[PDB]
């Protein structure tokens, strides 16, 4: 609805930065509303959903096992690894790593998982292979969060990301069991509380993944809907603002409040 663009445009004014937005019908793929849909923005941790999607594609094809155990050490640890920094001794399985990367945004978990699929290059090949000729991952954590102005490395567009998430959660791309595993990890997301979840009505469903990077970058991708089932995908990205994390979180929550009001 047009009133939600009023809020998105307002968000841009208050943040003094570009805001990209898209609302997509999950079932039909129809773009319901958008703002700067094809402009590039840093994915930050939102890429971890795509990473585990590629991992699950490997599992389905008999190339990976969710129960497989990965051993790592102190050397592997990078900034913000709340789950992985606690399992140095006995390691963690592929399943526990996707859980950590998605629900807690654990950077080391993401790096270990990228390593299993062949690095950023292979995640990008996976994406191109499923029809996303836009999204690209070029670096590892934490450098992928640099958000250098005009740099296309590690970026996506709201349209590209929304379409890709739709395919991952409803397409024949992944088996039914994997599709649901990916959704379950997003539903259990624990570090997106002040974003869309703070605007979600009781009884509504939400599976999401947020992200934060340098130079004011912030964003969130989500599948949400009334009565416990998702029915639309929402993607919100911004970069370039000098605003505080709280101010950035509030703008996203208000865009969320608006799209829920005009559902």
UniProtKB/Swiss-Prot annotation:
Family listed: Belongs to the class-A beta-lactamase family.
Top-rank taxon: Bacteria
Outcome (variant: residue 79 to K): In TEM-3, TEM-4, TEM-6, TEM-8, TEM-16 and TEM-24
Matching PROSITE patterns: BETA_LACTAMASE_A
Result, substituting residue 212 to T: In TEM-5 and TEM-24
Reaction(s) catalysed by this chain's protein: a beta-lactam + H2O = a substituted beta-amino acid
Biological process according to GO: beta-lactam antibiotic catabolic process; response to antibiotic
Taxonomy of the source species: Bacteria, Pseudomonadati, Pseudomonadota, Gammaproteobacteria, Enterobacterales
Active-site residues annotated for this sequence: 45, 143
Gene3D superfamilies: DD-peptidase/beta-lactamase superfamily
PANTHER family attached to this UniProt entry: BETA-LACTAMASE, BETA-LACTAMASE-TYPE TRANSPEPTIDASE FOLD CONTAINING PROTEIN
Protein EC: 3.5.2.6
Substitution effect: residue 213 to S: In TEM-3, TEM-4 and TEM-8
Keywords of this entry: Antibiotic resistance, Disulfide bond, Hydrolase, Plasmid, Signal, Transposable element
Further facts: The beta-lactamase present on pBR322 was cloned from plasmid R1 (R7268).
Residue sites binding substrate per the record: 209-211
Disulfide bond annotation, renumbered to this chain: 52-98
Pfam families hit by this protein: Beta-lactamase2
Organism (species): Escherichia coli
Top-rank EC class of the record's enzyme: hydrolase
Outcome after substituting residue 139 to S: In TEM-5, TEM-8 and TEM-24
Known role: TEM-type are the most prevalent beta-lactamases in enterobacteria; they hydrolyze the beta-lactam bond in susceptible beta-lactam antibiotics, thus conferring resistance to penicillins and cephalosporins. TEM-3 and TEM-4 are capable of hydrolyzing cefotaxime and ceftazidime. TEM-5 is capable of hydrolyzing ceftazidime. TEM-6 is capable of hydrolyzing ceftazidime and aztreonam. TEM-8/CAZ-2, TEM-16/CAZ-7 and TEM-24/CAZ-6 are markedly active against ceftazidime. IRT-4 shows resistance to beta-lactamase inhibitors.
GO molecular-function term, one example from the UniProt record: beta-lactamase activity
Outcome recorded upon mutating residue 14 to K: In TEM-2, TEM-3, TEM-8, TEM-16 and TEM-24
Uses: This protein is used as a marker in many commonly used cloning vectors, such as pBR322 and the pUC series.
This protein's name: Beta-lactamase TEM
